[PDB]
């Protein structure tokens, strides 16, 4: 749910899902459409897509465990959706740690009309 996720989040960029990541480009918050903005906007369209392949899930609120071996996140087993949409997770928070020395804050409060062209997952 978006509470393992926000919380994934701050213990990977030490920054706060919302708003940092909340209203941040064309894909991160509002789900959304054109071409993404930057890495840290590449991190939530593709995060996005992960969702999209979870028709039968509900990740804004299935909650999932995960606990970290070596700094590493691990995810717990649990059920089939949750097992997947924590590996969806997971890997937006190492999307978002790797691409920190990019991320603006230009990006931050994005206007829709901006976010022009297409991008199929
Ligand atoms: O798209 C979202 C996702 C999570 C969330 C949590 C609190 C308030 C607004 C939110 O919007």
Same mark, same amino acid.
Request: glycine letters at 10%; one cysteine or more; hydrophobic letters at 25%.
């Given at each position: 749910?978006?509470?393992?996720?926000?919380?994934?989040?701050?213990?990977?960029?030490?920054?706060?899902?919302?708003?940092?990541?909340?209203?941040?480009?064309?894909?991160?918050?509002?789900?959304?459409?054109?071409?993404?903005?930057?890495?840290?906007?590449?991190?939530?369209?593709?995060?996005?897509?992960?969702?999209? +392949?979870?028709?039968?899930?509900?990740?804004?609120?299935?909650?999932?465990?995960?606990?970290?071996? +070596?700094?590493?996140?691990?995810?717990?087993?649990?059920?089939?959706?949750?097992?997947?949409?924590?590996?969806?997770?997971?890997?937006?928070?190492?999307?978002?740690?790797? +691409?920190? +020395?990019?991320?603006?804050?230009?990006?931050?409060?994005?206007?829709?009309?901006?976010?022009?062209?297409?991008?199929?997952?």
């Amino acid at each position: 749910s978006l509470l393992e996720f926000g919380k994934m989040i701050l213990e990977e960029t030490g920054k706060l899902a919302i708003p940092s990541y909340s209203s941040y480009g064309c894909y991160c918050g509002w789900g959304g459409k054109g071409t993404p903005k930057d890495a840290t906007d590449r991190c939530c369209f593709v995060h996005d897509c992960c969702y999209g +392949n979870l028709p039968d899930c509900n990740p804004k609120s299935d909650r999932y465990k995960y606990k970290r071996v +070596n700094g590493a996140i691990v995810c717990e087993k649990g059920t089939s959706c949750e097992n997947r949409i924590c590996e969806c997770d997971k890997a937006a928070a190492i999307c978002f740690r790797q +691409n920190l +020395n990019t991320y603006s804050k230009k990006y931050m409060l994005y206007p829709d009309f901006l976010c022009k062209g297409e991008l199929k997952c």
